[PDB]
Design a binder for this molecule. Structure first.
Ligand SMILES: O=C(O)c1c(-c2ccc[nH]c2=O)c2c3occc3c(F)cc2n1Cc1cc2c(=O)[nH]cnc2cc1F
Length: 563
């Protein structure tokens, strides 16, 4: 069937859309080539619509059925809890899209009678009605990139009341079931440090390793009605409250498998028969579907001793080499099996015999040295997108601060330490906002974090070595230096000067600011300060940062204020 059908009504914005990076002094201090930075808008939605619309011709076989049964046997161990309306409301981000039913996310979080009454009515409707398709809004996503232009991605999501019901029925399932089914292959259970540990250990555990990333083209569009019902058959293996079993059954047929598309003007836009990007099950469903197809495809291709790592549609496989010619033919057989399963490739996969040459979750393993000179592996990435977005977030107030998430997740990197930390600490200190909580996203869930708490967060996630790394790889230094020239970012000597200046100001303030000066900026001086374990680090409640993926799932993981 067709992934989408369209009526001809346009994908519309619900307000003016900004496409160009503003010419602003603060963003200009970071990046001078402002014309190279753009944001996607609804103006490119028709180009995306064409790419995402195609027929799917899925063929399943014995390997697929065998893997599915193995996955279901593990899912059979799960006991999932139904969330109360109150627990589900508390998981709603404060700036979540309002309902069309007279209330918003703040009303949901406050347990307002209008919000709660409506959510209850939606819940009762899921229990009673097993068929009526649930309306969804389709919007063009606004994302910032550097030129060389990508058309806007399309987001599809149901109303706020439905999103709260999805949490009640499925938040516990999507949080716990992926690891029960996929074990060590489930990517979202790992912090970046644990991910690099798993990749390096897996790589070195093979006699002669071969690894590859597999890029599925337009993964959400490749997801079939069969795949969604297969996904539900795994969820159905959980022990569930009867209303949760009905709600999962109803949500599967009325929302997850497909449904009508409405634009921001309320016009009938089309019909979806593939994965919606903006529902609670997107991450979990995508991961299960990708793991299932890839595990079966590995068997069809006769790949030896596979270890996979999956995060949604992002797949990396590390196996035992059978020889160069054999590996090349076995990868072609894997691709052919994936294509039959409706997971055709974007970039054709290529065997890799150097772990540092593999990109997974847009990241690569690199090496640096700590204060003792010992090798430390860490995850890095090309800094182009992070810097273009950091420039955008400097010029405009954005709901999610990608810069903060990048500092947290890429804390050991040369670029996050020298550029991101220096830039934002300089500006926030000047504005008396170092202690002001900001929203960022970790594995798709929203968190409200104070920049002053970064030292303990980094110590907990990455270890104290994140504050001592030096002698970065020549390849990594070259990539950073090249990006800076491309974007018109000041050279690293300028960043060192700016860091020495903000470090001095931070130290002069005492308190948490002085902890930031000491730990975050020790790289900037010769007269190193002693870095001991931060008392605040061990007390940090990181319960739930690295449990599961929630991208598009409308999840907020920071604490609710007691009413
Ligand atoms: O956004 C993520 O879920 C994320 C981060 C992250 C980075 C920065 C801020 N907050 C974050 O959670 C992250 C991450 O951060 C550092 C290492 C590392 C890593 F290995 C995997 C990581 N993921 C999964 C993830 C990231 C990307 C991606 O970035 N591009 C394309 N496809 C992707 C597919 C994915 F499944």
């Amino acid at each position: 069937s067709m992934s989408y059908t369209w009526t001809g009504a346009l994908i519309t914005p619900c307000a003016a859309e900004e496409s160009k990076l503003p010419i602003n002094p603060l963003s200009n201090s970071l990046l001078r080539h402002h014309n190279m930075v753009y944001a996607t808008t609804s103006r490119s939605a028709s180009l995306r619509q064409k790419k995402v619309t195609f027929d799917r011709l899925q063929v399943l076989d014995d390997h697929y059925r065998d893997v599915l049964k193995e996955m279901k046997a593990k899912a059979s161990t799960v006991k999932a809890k139904l969330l109360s309306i109150e627990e589900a409301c508390k998981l709603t981000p404060p700036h979540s899209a309002k309902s069309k039913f007279g209330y918003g996310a703040k009303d949901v979080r406050n347990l307002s009678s209008r919000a709660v009454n409506h959510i209850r009515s939606v819940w009762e409707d899921l229990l009673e009605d097993t068929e009526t398709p649930i309306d969804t809004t389709i919007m063009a996503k606004s994302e910032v990139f550097c030129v060389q232009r990508k058309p806007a991605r399309l987001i599809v999501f149901p109303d706020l009341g439905v999103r709260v019901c999805e949490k009640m029925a499925l938040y516990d399932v999507v949080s716990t079931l992926p690891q029960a089914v996929m074990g060590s292959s489930y990517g979202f259970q790992y912090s970046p440090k644990q991910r690099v540990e798993f990749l390096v250990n897996t790589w070195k555990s093979k006699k002669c390793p071969m690894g590859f990333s597999y890029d599925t083209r337009c993964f959400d569009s490749t997801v079939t009605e069969s795949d969604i019902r297969v996904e539900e058959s795994i969820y159905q293996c959980c022990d569930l409250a009867p209303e949760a079993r009905q709600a999962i059954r109803s949500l599967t047929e009325r929302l997850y498998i497909g449904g009508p598309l409405t634009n921001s003007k309320g016009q009938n836009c089309g019909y979806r028969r593939c994965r919606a990007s903006g529902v609670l099950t997107t991450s979990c469903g995508n991961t299960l579907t990708c793991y299932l197809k890839a595990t079966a495809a590995c068997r069809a291709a006769k790949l030896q001793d596979c270890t996979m790592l999956v995060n949604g549609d992002d797949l990396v496989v590390i196996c035992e080499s059978a020889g160069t010619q054999e590996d090349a033919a076995a990868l072609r057989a894997f691709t052919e099996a994936m294509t039959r399963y409706s997971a055709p490739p974007g970039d054709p996969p290529q065997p890799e015999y150097d772990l540092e040459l593999i990109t997974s979750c847009s990241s690569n393993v690199s090496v640096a040295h700590d204060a003792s000179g010992k090798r430390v592996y860490y995850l890095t990435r090309d800094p182009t997108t992070p810097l273009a977005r950091a420039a955008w977030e400097t010029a405009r107030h954005t709901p999610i601060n990608s810069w903060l998430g990048n500092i947290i997740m890429y804390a050991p990197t040369l670029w996050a330490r020298m550029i991101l930390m220096t830039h934002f600490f300089s500006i926030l200190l000047a504005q008396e906002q170092l202690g002001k909580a900001l929203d960022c996203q970790i594995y798709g869930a929203c968190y409200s974090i104070e920049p002053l708490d970064l030292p303990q967060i980094i110590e907990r996630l990455h270890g104290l070595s994140a504050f001592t790394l030096h002698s970065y790889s020549p390849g990594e230094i070259n990539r950073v230096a090249s990006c800076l020239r491309k974007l018109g970012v000041p050279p690293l000597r300028t960043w060192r000067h700016r860091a020495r200046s903000v470090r001095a100001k931070l130290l002069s303030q005492g308190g948490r600011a002085a902890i930031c000066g000491r730990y975050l900026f020790n790289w900037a001086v010769r007269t190193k300060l002693k870095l001991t374990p931060i008392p605040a680090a061990s007390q940090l409640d990181l319960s739930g940062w690295f449990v599961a993926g929630y991208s598009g799932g409308d999840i907020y993981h920071s604490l609710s204020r007691a009413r």
